[model samples]
Target chain A: QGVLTQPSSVSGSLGQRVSITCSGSSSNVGRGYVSWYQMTPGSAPRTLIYGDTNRASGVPDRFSASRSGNTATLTISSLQAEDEADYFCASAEGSSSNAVFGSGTTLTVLGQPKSPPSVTLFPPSTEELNGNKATLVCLISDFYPGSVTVVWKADGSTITRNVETTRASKQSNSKYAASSYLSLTSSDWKSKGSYSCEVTHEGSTVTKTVKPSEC
Target chain B: VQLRESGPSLVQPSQTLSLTCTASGFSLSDKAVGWVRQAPGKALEWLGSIDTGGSTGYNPGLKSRLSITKDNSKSQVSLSVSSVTTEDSATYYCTTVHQETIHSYEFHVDAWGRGLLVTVSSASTTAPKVYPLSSCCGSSTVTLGCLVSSYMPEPVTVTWNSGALKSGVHTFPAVLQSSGLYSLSSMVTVPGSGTQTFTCNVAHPASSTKVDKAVDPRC
Candidate 1:
């Protein structure tokens, strides 16, 4: 599999222009158009540019791209604070015909980071729990600094096993958000009456609780 | 934009991997639901998708062993990957796709669930018992069918190769059996022939075995 190389991180100030580059080869960039994607912290990645320099319908013109030889670059002119996120470049291989993506480039907007997120608890549906499996999601949104820690608890007890935590990522507003999960079997889940999610950032903690729903 | 995925966190080798996705704030009839997976420490891969009406599409490599279905009554979609092993251990997410054009091309995954991890480990590591059977051969055409039974970790790739051929070689897709095993067939035709040898190769991550048959047709 061929790879597209990109800088790990790039930084710029408001109203400035920042460019992220990806290197490919004759079978990829040299032969076909390259595409770019923007990945916010807590959401799925969106295609920012397709067919080389063409932006997606909803994407702004400021986010432009160009290609030459075996390399492609994404340029964000008038970089706003809300533009902070991870950028990735991808293209189709000419021969084997699989896709090649750069590792990813994190774009940081210079200046002060935002505040902590407001956390919420969305327990699994009752019908779902009735089937003997449960999924608990700890959703946090609208926070800044993009480096919050999430922990789970069952009935006031800290949880460790069968837990998954996502990276604290930047949203479109330049705010940071993240989520964590705790999965349980019916035996381990029904024993508890409530679960809690604790979001920790900058020495402060925000907690949300949800009562186990009955079928 | 609410999406959630639920499934067992652990599974035994040779067992099926099943997951369900429940959604709200969107119309399932208008959107395409798909599954995206990442093997342990790997990049994300598009497994397959199914609409509310049962129309389906799959990643070519995973088409044989993967199935996508939906239950409109529950506002959910389900994915089943039969006969899994430790190699199938990974985080699986339910994704929502938006087609840029009328036909399916560049369908973007605009929404995604967190992920459900599946670790496949079992006490058994037995390979499938392969059977190669055929009927009387005819001139200008050769079709061979084989069955793989009692296989653990159900996904297997069957390849047909022939050293004796008047034309190019071709292999058909596998048809999974009710016992969770798989059956495959391949055929290649010739113009005028003497003695042509063919081989059927059954490939799996855990094992690779093949059977050979010689055809001497008086054409």
Candidate 2:
């Protein structure tokens, strides 16, 4: 939950109906219009419902929204795999110019088997090597369920400095993808040490390693 | 399907700026036309759009001072901005929206006119601050974002690797922040798997030299 409260995750099987709720206060949904946006991984958010109940120009009829009191709800009927994305609700603060957005809800379509992501490790670029810092990339792709964990290791020892991981984003092909970044000083990168990226999904783990000498 | 914008090259502060977009190869009665402007050295700003039914949408930030009207018989759309200031100096363009897919409501700029440069003459200037940001979109692509902010006299040019880029690049309009200074963002998507370095360069008249920032997505 953020400024506006929403469930972190929701699930429904194929052709099922699901409703995601957003709760706000008098400053927002209670006194102002509500809007809903749908965000798929790797694409910009699309206006699904505007002005609480009105659908955007080309939105599907299966998607509908409504508001009662200080709570707003988006209901998707006959849910499809394509509807598995993040939903966000927004509203303007009463009598003020301020606006607030819900924390976001991840919609998952049940009944699909879990799939682990493919992992790849990339070393720092030549330009990065010449600079004071070096960055390593761990690319994870084609996963299911959108939940994964990434760990970084330097020479078999866990390394935690400057490590950042992105949320699992759905791809054009419907599979999920994510990336993790690790930054190290140029001197540390050139120390002939091996770095490893470990990704775990659905109780399984995949690891990829890179050494400066190989590049 | 074709658009051409015509307007004055100069405007004085507190004056109104009028511009017109003439259409060719299409009828205004069946299409929606919109106005977009880029302040000198700034990003693009969407003024508003009007469909054949006279239904319209506008950027809430400029709604108070912006009005859009169309003359269907003449295939023309006109934009008027009241009480203009130096901040309004920009190249204004008329554009047609293209629906992205048959199933969804995604829309993008399909056709646009050669813009009309409107200069609202004024003096104060400030140099811009440039910053680099990068994130991986998926397994195959990474996006590089360049934020240029805190500048005056809105006329700036942004380049990738000091050259023109054609695809997967988007630069937004400059926004006046609470600081009273302006800020804008530009993004470009590239292959995510490679060992690569991308640079964003900003050139502003207020600054004696261009500002450059680089990002290595691998990091």
How far off is residue A6 in model 1, in Å? 2.8
The residue-by-residue lDDT of candidate 2 on A1-215, one tens digit each, is 12678899899999999999999986567653677877664333456876678888878899999989889999998899888888878665432122355777889888756788976566665555666656666667779877899999989999887776777766555667777767678888878568889999978999888777765
- Model 2 vs. true fold: TM: 0.47
Clashes of 1: 3
Worst 10 residues of 1 chain B by lDDT: B133-142
Model 1: residues with Cα > 4 Å off, grouped in runs: A94-100, A113-215, B1-6, B9-15, B20-35, B38-43, B46-91, B94-219
Report the lDDT of model 1 for residue B215: 30
